[PDB]
Amino acid sequence: NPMGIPIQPTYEKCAILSNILNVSFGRAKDYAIITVTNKATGEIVHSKTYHNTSIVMIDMSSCEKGEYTIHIILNDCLLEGTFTVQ
Amino acid sequence: NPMGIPIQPTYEKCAILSNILNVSFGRAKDYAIITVTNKATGEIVHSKTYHNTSIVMIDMSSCEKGEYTIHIILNDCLLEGTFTVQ
Numbered sequence: 447n448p449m450g451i452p453i454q455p456t457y458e459k460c461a462i463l464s465n466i467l468n469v470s471f472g473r474a475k476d477y478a479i480i481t482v483t484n485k486a487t488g489e490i491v492h493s494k495t496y497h498n499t500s501i502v503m504i505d506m507s508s509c510e511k512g513e514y515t516i517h518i519i520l521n522d523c524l525l526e527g528t529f530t531v532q
Numbered sequence: 533n534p535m536g537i538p539i540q541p542t543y544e545k546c547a548i549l550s551n552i553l554n555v556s557f558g559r560a561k562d563y564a565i566i567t568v569t570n571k572a573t574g575e576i577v578h579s580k581t582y583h584n585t586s587i588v589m590i591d592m593s594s595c596e597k598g599e600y601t602i603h604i605i606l607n608d609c610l611l612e613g614t615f616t617v618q
Contacts, residue, residue: 451548451553451615453541453612458539516539521606523541523607525609526542529535
């Protein structure tokens with residue numbers, strides 16, 4: 447039986463509570479881009495390059511309700527996730 | 533309620549069938565390291581840097597049975613997964 451093997455970054459983690467989005471960089475990279483996009487409309491609601499940063503917290507409590515994608519861009523790897531703003 | 537947001541690489545995927553491990557690079561990078569390690573013993577059973585490669589296939593059919601970790605190393609991101617050789 448064929449089986450997918452999920453792959454995840456070791457050092458980058460993401461979570462949300464009370465519409466506060468958290469990105470954690472467990473080894474603080476020289477550069478990381480975080481871009482957050484409304485999945486229904488394509489509106490970019492956050493896009494910033496970070497330097498020497500461990501914790502990024504983004505308040506999504508005023509944003510449109512629905513699904514969003516997060517992109518975290520490292521050298522060349524493009525990391526992605528999807529989350530819900532309720 | 534707190535919620536984790538799984539993050540995955542966009543371009544790198546992994547799967548297994550009949551103990552043939554497959555790694556696919558959807559945008560063929562200038563460099564990627566693939567290292568496969570027996571999780572019980574720490575024995576490294578594969579470790580190679582690839583260049584301009586789209587598909588890597590690794591025959592695990594002679595390897596010890598049990599759990600393995602795969603690491604895929606890109607610029608600085610360290611991607612990880614776990615899989616079973618039965």
